[PDB]
């Protein structure tokens, strides 16, 4: 299902990838990628799959590129296929009260009980689905947490949130409902507030005035559903690669202070977002001739798979010196929810191999990897013996 | 390596920070909140934003042409030794570096 060749591309930069079918698949979707940066690939190549697009594949473009906001623009960061800096900047300034750094801190205690909570339903079982049974429902009932919402309403969310990403709705609609539960919430918070994310968001301010009931909902919808996908997929490739490997597991088992150097060298291992931006003018980027609407996927994900960034990059080092990455993105845009996530990974591992210690991917099953803009994994299926196991 | 970081109101967060971290990036480690690094350091927030005490603002070097044009959109007061911190990484010659800290990034 191929594009024409634009008339400014040359074909020796012609390079045969689709990121949502990618030939590799089944060595793991980050080696599927890893293709565009064989000995003899070019730093930036154009697939005529998915419409017509570039790709830049070294992370020296890729950071250069997300720089310079000017050239390329993200009013079209999606392939296939906004608001201006000063409503940006208000956007982000109040995004960073409601899941910043001093947020995280004093919620962390509680992350960590609910982290609890979760293993240890599922420990004495000895089995379980990570994917359905941990991975999605600990950072849709950590939002619960910080939005200050009842546990109660989780299995609606829970639906309405899956549609977004699966059932009988359209994406419009699922989008609706969410914003149809969040109008009333965010009007009964609002001028008589508390501390929740919902409250914040509901009494901000923008451009000197209240923030209206639908900015709110907009913004509230999109720090629930931002950190969903990519949160339940990174944890799958994680406990994914910790269950075939037994030497990394006991390295944090005996020396639980490097937890927080290995979750970063595991997101730079298995990252998993790619998006990009569009041309907002001709632009010779890189001796490469670009045209204004071009689009130029940047994935965020092979940065740090880059061996000119980092040496071996394939091989996992929970002591690697320099790690390098642009997991979170790079730019103005770089993840608001990075501080977040940063330590729902760190507290996963921390609770989970301290009750969990030993454990395997299930007999014969084969762990499929799914690539596109947000990669991930179908199931992770995983065994231990729970008279192995520790509750806490 | 020690890092001295002095709050608007006084406060003082005096900071082991190892070689090659940016002085945005131990900060945001350490619960010194009044520096929040919202670009995640690439000089495109200017959120980071510090003031570098006199008896090192030369043993720094210089702010690049892209934190320079960041700098103009401080919200605090910007002044000659105005940094950007996530610009500025710790190295062993740098210790005892005092860096003030505005009263708003935001
Ligand atoms: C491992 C976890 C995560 C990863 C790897 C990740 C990755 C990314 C990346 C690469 C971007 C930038 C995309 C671009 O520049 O085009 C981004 C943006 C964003 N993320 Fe995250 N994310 C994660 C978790 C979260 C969480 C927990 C939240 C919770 C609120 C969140 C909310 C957002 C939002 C709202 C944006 C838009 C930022 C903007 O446009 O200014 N993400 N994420
Ligand atoms: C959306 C995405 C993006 O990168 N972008 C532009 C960057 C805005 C912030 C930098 C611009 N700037 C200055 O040139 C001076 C002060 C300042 O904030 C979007 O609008
Ligand atoms: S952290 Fe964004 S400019 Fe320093
Ligand atoms: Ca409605």
């Not at chain 1, 024409?4 to 930069?13: A, F, G, R, S, T």
């Not at chain 1, 009260?97 to 609890?116: F, T, W, Y």
């Not at chain 1, 501080?339 to 007999?363: C, G, M, N, Q, Y």
């Not at chain 2, 042409?65 to 940094?83: D, F, Y």
Request: aromatic share 8%.
């Amino acid at each position: 299902n191929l594009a024409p060749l634009p008339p400014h591309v040359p074909e020796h930069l012609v390079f045969d990838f689709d990121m949502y079918n990618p030939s590799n698949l089944s060595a793991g979707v980050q080696e599927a990628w890893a293709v565009l940066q064989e000995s003899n690939v070019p730093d930036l190549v154009w697939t005529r799959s998915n419409g017509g697009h570039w790709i830049a594949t070294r992370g020296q473009l890729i950071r250069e590129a997300y720089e310079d906001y000017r050239h390329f623009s993200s009013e079209s960061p999606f392939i296939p296929r906004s608001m201006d800096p000063p409503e940006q900047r208000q956007f982000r300034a109040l995004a960073n009260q409601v899941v910043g750094m001093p947020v995280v801190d004093k919620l962390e205690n509680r992350i960590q009980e609910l982290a609890s909570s979760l293993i240890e339903s599922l420990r004495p079982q000895g089995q379980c689905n990570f994917t359905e049974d941990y991975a999605e429902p600990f950072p849709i009932r950590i939002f619960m947490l910080l939005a200050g919402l009842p546990e109660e309403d989780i299995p609606h969310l829970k639906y309405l949130t899956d549609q977004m990403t699966r059932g009988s709705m359209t994406f419009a609609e699922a989008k609706e409902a969410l914003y149809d539960y969040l109008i009333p919430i965010i009007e009964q918070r609002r001028q008589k507030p508390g501390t929740d994310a919902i409250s914040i968001v509901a009494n901000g301010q923008v451009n000197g005035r209240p923030i209206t009931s639908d900015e709110a909902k907009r913004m509230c919808g999109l720090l629930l559903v931002g950190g969903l996908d990519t949160v339940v997929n990174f944890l799958s490739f994680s406990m994914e690669f910790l269950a075939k490997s037994p030497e990394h597991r006991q390295e944090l088992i005996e020396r639980p202070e490097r937890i927080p150097a290995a979750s970063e060298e595991l997101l730079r291992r298995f990252s998993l977002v790619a998006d990009g931006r569009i041309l907002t003018s001709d632009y010779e980027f890189h001796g490469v001739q670009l045209k204004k609407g071009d689009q130029i996927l940047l994935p965020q994900m092979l940065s740090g798979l880059d061996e000119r960034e980092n040496a071996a990059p394939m091989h996992v080092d929970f002591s690697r010196q320099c790690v390098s990455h642009t997991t979170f993105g790079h730019g103005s845009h770089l993840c608001l929810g990075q501080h977040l996530a940063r330590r729902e990974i760190i507290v996963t591992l921390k609770e989970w191999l301290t009750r969990i210690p030993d454990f395997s991917i299930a007999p014969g099953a084969q762990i499929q990897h799914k690539s596109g803009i947000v990669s991930g994994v179908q199931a992770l299926p995983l065994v231990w013996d729970p008279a192995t196991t520790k509750a806490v | 390596s020690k890092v001295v970081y002095v709050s608007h109101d006084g406060t003082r967060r005096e900071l082991d920070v190892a070689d090659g971290v940016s002085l945005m990036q131990a900060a945001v480690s350490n619960g010194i909140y009044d520096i929040v690094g919202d670009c995640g350091g690439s000089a495109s927030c200017a959120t980071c934003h510090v003031y570098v005490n006199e008896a090192f603002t030369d043993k720094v070097p210089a702010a690049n042409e892209r934190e320079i044009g960041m700098l103009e959109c401080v919200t605090a007061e910007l002044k000659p030794n105005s940094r950007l911190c996530c610009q500025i990484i710790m190295t062993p010659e740098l210790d005892g570096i005092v860096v003030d800290v505005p009263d708003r990034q935001w």
